[PDB]
Every structure is written in structure tokens, then in C-alpha cells.
């Protein structure tokens, strides 16, 4: 299909891949419990 490829290209142009990998790589802490109202 063509319009599917168009929508995929639109999403790719709107959201960069480097932003995604950087946001995935944050390595949140693993905590006596803590509060889960954060990342």
C-alpha cells in the first residue's frame, strides 16, 4: 500500500529515532520502598 507508507513516513519525520533510543535508555533506579509517581 502507498498511504500506509505515507503515514509511516509522517510518523518517522515527526518522531526521531535518536530521541526514542535516548528516552528508552534512562535506566531508572530499583529501590524500604519508594514512590512510583515518577518515571
Amino acid at each position: 500500500k502507498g498511504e500506509a507508507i505515507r503515514i509511516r513516513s509522517i510518523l518517522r519525520s515527526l518522531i526521531p529515532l535518536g530521541d526514542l533510543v535516548g528516552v528508552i535508555s534512562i535506566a531508572f533506579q530499583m529501590p524500604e520502598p519508594d514512590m512510583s509517581a515518577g518515571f
Binding site: 502507498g2 505515507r6 513516513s9 509522517i10 519525520s13 515527526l14
Partner: protein
């Protein structure tokens, strides 16, 4: 009331109200050397005239979205709203498309607009929409209608981006009004008749000479000088002239007697200017006054009619031919006429 057919030359302008000042910026394309387009100042044409030669596009095909996707998955028509158009640059011959790379860093989501050679893909097509509620889809497009161009590939608007120096039209999601101004209606252009915006030269009846400037062997200050010359200069690049009409619409119509137009040198890019202390020379566009650089063609030597023609909004009438049409140059201020001199003294007459 005039409809927009196919195979006609148009100009795409827009209005920008920046820094509490309105301006009319048009879409231009260099074509050779670079791919991306840029902006041209149609307004403020009193001292700096716009290069109308590169701001000219031609609509080739007007297909619906169904027919477009169908041909992509595989005549004098009338422009209708909702259709998809193909804007071929008149000068470069390439086609207007939306690029994939980005140049203006203030939009991390927009794409640039430029030219490409092939017509394959959805990039070179642009779907047309109205900018008012009075005209719906399927209606016939006319002159003066505010139009919106959307990319068929990226589904982005032909947006007018603002910047300190990056005054560059982009493909963004914020729409922008665009005005269409015709130049040549694609109708019967009279063969052998002079048409506006043409690149031509002049010759004499029994002298076989042409109006030109010195060649590149001399400096630019010497090339600024103007004269007549014969021989191999009959077929040269430095012997051609362009009639740049002051109008932004229908300037490529049948040029009639008396109307003003600048004479641009295609090799130097300058205009034939005149300051009274001296004769006519060549000066750039950054200081081209309409009053100083405007000329006209008369059919006689008298001054019977000067301010008789004001404005004709149409293709005009086939009046001036090429071969048997004896014109006479006449300046709009002093009204002088061309004279050939004998600057070369008899000491060097048989030379150049």
C-alpha cells in the same frame, strides 16, 4: 472570470505582514546550480525589480486524486478545486517537488520545496484547495482566487516560513494563502510577433549590426559601455536583450507601442540606465529606478501620443512583429532616440 486552463504560465505570489509591514513575496527557482527554491520581492519594484524570469511555472496536468494514485500505481483542460497539479518550471524545465531533507532548523518537522527532473512519485504533484468558504471543491478556478497547495507525498502545506535570513518557503502544517497571476494564457501566441518576456536582439536594415557591449577581455567598467557591432557578434550571448515588463500579471502578453519596459542584458544581468550628465550605460538591479530604466518602442519619430495607453488586462493584440516591424527606442523621461556615432577617429577607423 477568466478560467485557468492547462499549459499556461503562472506566477505564485503571497502576502507577508512582518515587522508591522506588508510585502508581496513570490516563489522563485534558480534551476541550474541548486535545487531548492527561494523567495522574490515582487513589491518594492521601484528601485529593485524582481527577476520575473525564474518566478514562472507552467501547469502540465490536472488529474483528480483517484486518477493520480491510479497512474502512480500503474489538452486544454480546466483547473478545478481538489485536483492535483504538476508545476513545471518554465526556465529550468524541472518540476516542483517537496524535498526530504531539512534546512531551516526552526522547524524540526518541515521539508523543503525544490525542483527535480523526473515526474515519478508523489513529490512532484500538488493538490489544490480553496481558501474561502464561498468556493467548494469541484468548482472552476479563476484569477484572484486564494489557493492552498498541499503536498501529495507529505500531506504538508506550502508554508511561508519566517526567519532572520532563512526567508525560505517550506512544507509545514500551517497553511498559507497563495495568489496565482497568469503571464501567458497558452492561447494562440502569434508566431513572428513580439511577445512579452522574450529574449531577443535588434539589427539594422542595411548595416548588419547589433546593439551590444564589449566582450569579457575588458574589465567590467568597460563592459558597462554600450555600442553597436557587427560580424560574429550577430550570434553571441553578449548581444541579447530581455524586455522585462513592469507588470506582475500578463507581462508575457503581446507588447504594444508606448508601454514601459526595462531592457535587461542576459549576460551581465544589468539594465540600460541613463543619468543626464552622461549617456546610457549598464547598472545593476539593486538601484534600478523605474523612471530611469523604463523605455518604450515607437512607430515614428514624433511625439503625437505618449500617455495614451494605461492598462490592458489580457493577452492583448498581435501588433509588433519581428522582421518587418521598424521600432524606435524612446526613453520615458527625455524621449530621446537612438543615434549611431563616429567615436572611432580616422586614425583607427579600419580597426575595431
Amino acid at each position: 472570470i477568466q478560467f485557468l486552463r492547462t499549459d499556461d504560465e503562472v506566477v505564485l505570489q503571497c502576502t507577508a505582514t512582518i515587522h508591522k509591514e506588508q510585502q508581496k513575496l513570490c516563489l522563485a527557482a534558480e534551476g541550474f546550480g541548486n535545487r531548492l527554491c527561494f523567495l522574490e520581492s515582487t513589491s518594492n519594484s521601484k528601485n529593485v525589480p524582481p527577476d520575473l524570469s525564474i518566478c514562472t511555472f507552467v501547469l502540465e496536468q490536472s488529474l483528480s486524486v483517484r486518477a493520480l494514485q491510479e497512474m502512480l500505481a500503474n489538452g486544454h483542460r480546466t483547473l478545478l478545486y481538489g485536483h492535483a497539479i504538476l508545476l513545471r518550471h518554465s526556465y529550468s524545465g524541472m518540476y516542483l517537488c517537496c524535498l526530504s531533507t531539512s534546512r531551516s532548523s526552526t522547524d524540526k518537522l518541515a521539508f523543503d520545496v525544490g525542483l527535480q527532473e523526473d515526474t515519478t512519485g508523489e513529490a512532484c504533484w500538488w493538490t489544490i484547495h480553496p481558501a474561502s468558504k464561498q468556493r467548494s471543491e469541484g468548482e472552476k478556478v479563476r484569477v484572484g482566487d486564494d489557493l492552498i497547495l498541499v503536498s501529495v507525498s507529505s500531506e504538508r502545506y506550502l508554508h511561508l516560513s519566517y526567519g532572520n535570513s532563512s526567508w525560505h518557503v517550506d512544507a509545514a502544517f500551517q497553511q498559507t494563502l497563495w495568489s496565482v497571476a497568469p503571464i501567458s494564457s497558452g492561447s494562440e501566441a502569434a508566431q513572428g510577433y513580439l511577445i512579452g518576456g522574450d529574449v531577443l536582439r535588434l539589427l539594422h536594415g542595411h548595416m548588419d549590426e547589433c546593439l551590444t557591449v564589449p566582450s569579457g577581455e575588458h574589465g567590467e567598467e568597460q563592459r558597462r559601455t554600450v555600442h553597436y557591432e557587427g560580424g560574429a557578434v550577430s550570434v553571441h550571448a553578449r548581444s541579447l536583450w530581455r524586455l522585462e515588463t513592469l507588470r506582475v500579471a500578463w507581462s508575457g502578453s503581446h507588447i504594444r507601442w508606448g508601454q514601459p519596459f526595462r531592457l535587461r542584458h542576459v549576460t551581465t544581468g544589468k539594465y540600460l540606465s541613463l543619468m543626464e550628465d552622461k549617456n546610457l550605460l549598464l547598472m545593476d538591479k539593486e538601484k534600478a529606478d523605474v523612471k530611469s530604466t523604463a523605455f518604450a518602442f515607437r512607430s515614428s519619430k514624433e511625439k503625437l501620443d505618449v500617455g495614451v495607453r494605461k492598462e490592458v488586462d489580457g493577452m492583448g493584440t498581435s501588433e509588433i512583429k519581428y522582421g518587418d516591424s521598424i521600432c524606435y527606442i524612446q526613453h520615458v523621461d527625455t524621449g530621446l532616440w537612438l543615434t549611431y556615432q563616429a567615436v572611432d577617429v580616422k586614425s583607427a577607423r579600419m580597426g575595431s
